[PDB]
Amino acid sequence: MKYAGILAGGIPLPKQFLDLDNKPILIHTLEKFILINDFEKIIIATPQQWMTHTKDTLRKFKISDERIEVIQGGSDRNDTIMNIVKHIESTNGINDDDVIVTHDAVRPFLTHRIIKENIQAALEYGAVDTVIDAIDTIVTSKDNQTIDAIPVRNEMYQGQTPQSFNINLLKESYAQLSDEQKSILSDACKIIVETNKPVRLVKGELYNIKVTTPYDLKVANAIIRG
Amino acid sequence: KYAGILAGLPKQFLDLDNKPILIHTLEKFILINDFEKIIIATPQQWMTHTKDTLRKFKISDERIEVIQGGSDRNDTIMNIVKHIESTNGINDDDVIVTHDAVRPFLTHRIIKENIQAALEYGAVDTVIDAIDTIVTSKDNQTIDAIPVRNEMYQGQTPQSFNINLLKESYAQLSDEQKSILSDACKIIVETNKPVRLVKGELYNIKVTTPYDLKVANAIIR
């Protein structure tokens, strides 16, 4: 079975509640998932502080899909994903072949194609990162002052989301980490990488941006109209 | 201090809010008086159009000169410095701020900081902190590594240099080696000199694709 985990983080107002053509970013994102019947549940995890606001917002914009549930997020991105896993486990149990497609609420421009390919790659390979080829040259620095290296450009990618997993694999790898590894690891796919399992790449889109700044909001208002 | 604006219908003539990208870029350099010359290097076929475009948009600065570009980006940078050499000579402390014409959103701050860093350290890259997690891959299919997030930056332009240092570094390499390293700061790196960082802006994008042009019109509007 296939599940969606929508990560709706905190911060005056979290950016997923900003308006994009008179509809909050969160609603744009959710509408993309509602149109795929493959998902058994579509779970929005958000800090307690924003839970009622999330529920109210879904109602205001006539979201009525019976698969949507709003739950409390965790202490970091990965703890939030594991809260979603525990919610699925408590309500439906977990099957051998279950996959979860996790995705940032402030990325409203992912496509049907991206979601369906994430599901298929998660079933085939167990772990999936959505990335694009680096738009600008990647430059590395250990001191925030001088160049350390300029790596080979065709090997560099910028990560987006979704990030998708066989759920049992994600549980086993998260259990396989160190309290320090859990403690500093802020990427979900790094959980898999660091327990030395393969992570497949799904190519994103240049417009699959994260809306975090005013500049992003300007671009997002342009994207939403095309 | 010299400006070298690299101009490869070419994308720098595409309209951005009803004014070509090249003019947007040039206007930021014209408002910095430190520059002794502002040189636009572009292929022969585009020199008069370039000149005409500057006249059409009331660019009236005696420091602007349009010269013939080179066989690649690095050969064009060296065409610029050789033009500077033939016209004015080179002083010990001369710097050049090189910049892509299709990056119209650089700021006064960025240019001024590029000037200080070139005078202080000899070589400078304009970069921004990586907005997304950087992932590496050897097969274009599976992750190889996820490097440390705070060490990752995205390179933009300007890239600015003490001119004698750049002459010396380009002279000590192979032109085949030069072309396989087409980043100017990568060539300085490979000639064993340090490169200082100046922080750009998230909007200091290059306008190369139709999608980029849409984003650029969104930024400006």
Swiss-Prot record, chain A:
Keywords, sorted A to Z: Cell wall biogenesis/degradation, Nucleotidyltransferase, Teichoic acid biosynthesis, Transferase
A GO biological-process term: cell wall organization
GO molecular function, one term: 2-C-methyl-D-erythritol 4-phosphate cytidylyltransferase activity
UniProt source species: Staphylococcus aureus (strain NCTC 8325 / PS 47)
Marked site (Transition state stabilizer) residue numbers: 15
Record-linked PROSITE patterns: ISPD (PS01295)
Record field: catalytic activity: D-ribitol 5-phosphate + CTP + H(+) = CDP-L-ribitol + diphosphate
Record's protein name: Ribitol-5-phosphate cytidylyltransferase 1
Subunit structure: Heterodimer together with TarJ.
Broad class of enzyme this protein falls into: transferase
Gene label: tarI
PANTHER family attached to this UniProt entry: 2-C-METHYL-D-ERYTHRITOL 4-PHOSPHATE CYTIDYLYLTRANSFERASE, CHLOROPLASTIC, RIBITOL-5-PHOSPHATE CYTIDYLYLTRANSFERASE
